[PDB]
RNA sequence: CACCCACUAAUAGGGAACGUGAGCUGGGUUUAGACCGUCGUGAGACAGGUUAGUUUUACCCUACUGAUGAUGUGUUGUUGC
RNA sequence: CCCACUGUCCCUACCUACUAUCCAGCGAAACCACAGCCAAGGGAACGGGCUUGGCGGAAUCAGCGGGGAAAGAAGACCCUG
RNA sequence: AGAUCUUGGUGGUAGUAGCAAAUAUUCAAACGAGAACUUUGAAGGCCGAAGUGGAGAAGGGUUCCAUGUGAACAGCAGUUGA
């Protein structure tokens, strides 16, 4: 439903900002049950939570 | 029906169209529109502008 | 205290109710004074502002710098399909003014004319005049009509005829025609009644109403500019840039006394869409329109005595925002109020044209037909193709057409 | 409870009442005057049309500054508006009255709004701030509503 | 106000709360800072000079400009005076 | 004062953004003897009311700033105590 | 009945002024009675390291965190919230 807590926990555990945290919209129900960092780690391992890749800034023009 | 004129671009200028420009030195020119007059006023060569008649006859187009 | 310098008043006090026209047509309000010695003739007409262009002609005004010289004069094209007369109104003179005496409508009213009677033609049952026209057939209604004509003949002082335009002939969206009372003059009451009675259910071409190189009056409603401030509505002086609460205003709207605002103080409000009457407009050319006797003829609209080019009055690409003109058109001199596709009323001059401005013969030498949807540079398709030669789409169309 | 204007026959009639309804009182009054005397189905479809801005209510008494809309010409009036909140509140009240009419076991196909009344509810205080550190009231104007329907057809 | 330049047929005189600041401006007068000269012992003054110095609110009534309407003709429309 | 510069101006126009405008919701404040058509008269010597006369037609909208000797301070100028 | 009276209540104004300082939001989905404002994803942007980031002092004092509610408040709303 409202996964701000889950987003915060994922951002803290993954040690990345909330921008890079990807939560699966399909398994919203499964995520909402996770209220502990251990459960967040389990979801990360299962693949429901993905650390999105860093936005590309290429220096090829600069080079 | 009066005298037909030729512009910087070489087009015919019908009466009631364009403008007539006379310099101080003693030459009088006429331009079909503000585009042709502006091109003349930057001293742009007619032969290098693709849609001018002069460029067309220089490059044997058509 | 007096104002330190004198200055003419901004704005006209002859147009003070500066408000939108309550009518869209533009009514006559003053017809030419009748005289029975003249032949029976109409006095006015309905036109539509097709657009504007310019012409080349030689002036034959002696003693001027422009004698035997060629000038360029802007003109206005007014498309005027022949009016269809459907009725007659007779008026009787009273000490209380003119009042309507008796009205007669013709049978077989045109479908477009009947639409004027309906605000919503779409859902109508189309019943208008359906019971009325049946009295043109039975003997009782016929006798009633004959008594009506006799009463008009023996009582009415002036009469008018109702003519309507032909919407199907115009390229506009609106299919609702325009009705009009046109006064008939030049003869006795019986004579004009007989002439109109002949002309019921008939078409009156514009050439039978107005003539060449004759100066007429133009009536219409101007371009509605919407709500406007004082600066544009009255052309008063702008305030200095240091002005606090507004520079496009009038600084003083009246002295302390008489403790009110005089009507003559310029104030913001509606601009344009004003019913105006313009006079002294010379008719340079009355067009003939499109014919097909064997093929379509378009030269008659734009070819002059010295051009001889098979081209129409329609400019390259048609008239801006208007369409294509195929029917009888009138080429006035100068500007005409109202936008494109705005209905206009043209009337014979109420005055006597004795000035050498008037009654001067008009001979066109060249009529511009360049495209006004931009800076047009070619008179005709033929000349444009001749100058530019073949083109890429031309080549590819020839390729598929072999 | 003591309804104003009790019906002539309190057997063919049903009652609905509301108190402290968080709606504008003047808008409610104009709406109630608009729907007065209507059949219940006609009133319901009319309020739904108000919601969709297809039918406008004539603002007759409290018309200060109210703009002009074309649909006002249905009435002999010029000013009109489409109060959404008033429409929803009257819809809830009307459905409550319909439920009461069902409970009295009289058919709801024959109901006409013979009586309706809007009265100002007690005002509630809110606070605002002005240019020189001044405080102005930010009062609310709720309203109490009562109505009486009646079987007639 | 005055005067001059120039043009013009002519550059007449005035009123409307010495018209018109919820229209403007603030150059002057007429606060508080400050200098000069004159006066006074002094604080300070000077229709003497100079400089710098906050110009608020209209959504109310009415007026005025426009815009819907509104009264009767049964309704409604067209054309008109 | 001069060179240049330019919408300060001749002489105004157009365009953009936000407002104002209308709708949804929410929603005050100043002010208010009563109310608000004018001319003349008299009058506390400049009336919305009174007399004389001109007249006068529900409800309202967007403007507007002529009037309400508009509002804002028991005049700071001057005089008396 | 007055005292620009005191206290308290209520009107016209008026559903009016107004809710315009800092470029910008859109689609889909979910919960939910109810979604412009809740949450997720996608997109477009912005802050552009002298930040709309990360942390401290003074000051505040539980606002911190979880769960729950839609009475009041967050000048619209809110299933959200200091
Ligand atoms: Mg200023
Ligand atoms: Mg053009
Ligand atoms: Mg108002
Ligand atoms: Mg407003
Ligand atoms: Mg504030
Ligand atoms: Mg403060
Ligand atoms: Mg004078
Ligand atoms: Mg004065
Ligand atoms: Mg003033
Ligand atoms: Mg002022
Ligand atoms: Mg000054
Ligand atoms: Mg000083
Ligand atoms: Mg001394
Ligand atoms: Mg300074
Ligand atoms: Mg008076
Ligand atoms: Mg005093
Ligand atoms: Mg005092
Ligand atoms: Mg008392
Ligand atoms: Mg007393
Ligand atoms: Mg008191
Ligand atoms: Mg507002
Ligand atoms: Mg705002
Ligand atoms: Mg950036
Ligand atoms: Mg920081
Ligand atoms: Mg918290
Ligand atoms: Mg709120």
UniProtKB/TrEMBL annotation, chain B:
Tell me where in this chain the TRASH domain is found: 6-44
What binding partners and quaternary form does the record give?
Answer: Component of the large ribosomal subunit.
Q: Which family does it belong to?
A: Belongs to the eukaryotic ribosomal protein eL24 family.
Q: Which residues of the full protein are shown?
A: 1 to 62 of 135
Which protein are we looking at? Answer: Large ribosomal subunit protein eL24
Task: State the compartments where it is located.
Answer: Cytoplasm
């Amino acid at each position: 439903s409202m996964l701000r807590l889950q987003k915060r926990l994922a951002s803290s555990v993954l040690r990345c900002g909330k921008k890079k945290v990807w939560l699966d919209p399909n398994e919203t129900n499964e995520i909402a049950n996770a209220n502990s960092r251990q459960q967040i780690r389990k979801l990360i391992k299962d693949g429901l939570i993905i650390r999105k890749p860093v936005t590309v800034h290429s220096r090829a023009r600069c080079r | 029906m009066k005298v037909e004129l030729c512009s910087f671009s070489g087009y015919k200028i019908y009466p009631g169209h364009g403008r007539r420009y006379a310099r101080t030195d003693g030459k009088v020119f006429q331009f079909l529109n503000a585009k042709c007059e502006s091109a003349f006023l930057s001293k742009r060569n007619p032969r290098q502008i693709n849609w001018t008649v002069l460029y067309r006859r220089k490059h044997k187009k058509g | 205290s007096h104002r330190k310098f004198s200055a003419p008043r901004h704005g006209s006090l002859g147009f003070l109710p500066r408000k939108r026209s309550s009518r869209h047509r533009g009514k006559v309000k003053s017809f030419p004074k009748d005289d029975p010695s003249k032949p029976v003739h109409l006095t006015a007409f309905l036109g539509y502002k097709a657009g504007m262009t310019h012409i080349v002609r030689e002036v034959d005004r002696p003693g001027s710098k422009v004698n035997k010289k060629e000038v360029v004069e802007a003109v206005t094209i007014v498309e005027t399909p022949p009016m269809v007369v459907v009725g007659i109104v007779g008026y009787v003179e009273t000490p209380r003014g003119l009042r309507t005496f008796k009205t007669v409508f013709a049978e077989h009213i045109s479908d477009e004319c009947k639409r004027r009677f309906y605000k919503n033609w779409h859902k109508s049952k189309k019943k208008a005049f359906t019971k009325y026209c049946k009295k043109w057939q039975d003997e009782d209604g016929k006798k009633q009509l004959e008594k009506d004509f006799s009463s008009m003949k023996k009582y009415c002082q002036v009469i008018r005829v109702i003519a309507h335009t032909q919407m199907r002939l115009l390229p506009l969206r609106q299919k609702k025609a325009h009705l009009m009372e046109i006064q008939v003059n030049g003869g006795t009451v019986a004579e004009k009644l007989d002439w109109a009675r002949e002309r019921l259910e008939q078409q009156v071409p514009v050439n039978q109403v107005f003539g060449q190189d004759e100066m007429i009056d133009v009536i219409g409603v101007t371009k509605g500019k919407g709500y406007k401030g004082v600066t544009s509505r009255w052309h008063t002086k702008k305030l200095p840039r240091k002005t606090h609460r507004g520079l496009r205003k009038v600084a003083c709207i009246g002295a302390w006394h008489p403790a009110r605002v005089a009507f003559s103080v310029a104030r913001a409000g509606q601009k344009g869409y004003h019913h105006r009457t313009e006079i002294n407009k010379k008719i340079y050319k009355i067009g003939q329109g499109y014919l097909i006797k064997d093929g379509k003829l378009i030269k008659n609209n734009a070819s002059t005595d010295y051009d001889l080019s098979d081209k129409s009055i329609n400019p390259l690409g048609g008239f801006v925002h208007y369409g294509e003109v195929t029917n009888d058109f009138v080429m006035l001199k100068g500007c005409v109020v109202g936008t494109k596709k705005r209905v206009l009323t043209l009337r014979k001059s109420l005055l006597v044209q004795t000035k050498r401005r008037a009654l001067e013969k008009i001979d066109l030498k060249f009529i511009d037909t360049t495209s006004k949807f931009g800076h047009g540079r070619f008179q005709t398709m033929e000349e444009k193709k001749a100058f530019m030669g073949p083109l890429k789409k031309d080549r590819i169309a020839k390729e598929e057409g072999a | 409870v003591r309804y104003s204007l009790d019906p002539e026959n309190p057997t063919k009639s049903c009652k609905s009442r509301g108190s402290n309804l968080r709606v504008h009182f003047k808008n409610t009054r104009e709406t109630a005057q608009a729907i007065k005397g209507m059949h219940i189905r006609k009133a319901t479809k009319y309020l739904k049309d108000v919601t969709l801005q297809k039918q406008c209510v004539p603002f007759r008494r409290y018309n200060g500054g109210v703009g002009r809309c074309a649909q006002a010409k249905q009435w002999g009036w010029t000013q009109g508006r489409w109060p959404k909140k008033s429409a929803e509140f009257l819809l809830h009240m009307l459905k409550n009255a319909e439920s009461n009419a069902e409970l009295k076991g009289l058919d709801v196909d024959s109901l006409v709004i013979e009586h309706i009344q809007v009265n100002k509810a007690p005002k509630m205080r809110r606070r605002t701030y002005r240019a020189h550190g001044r405080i102005n009231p930010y009062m609310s104007s709720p309203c109490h509503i009562e109505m009486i329907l009646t079987e007639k057809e």
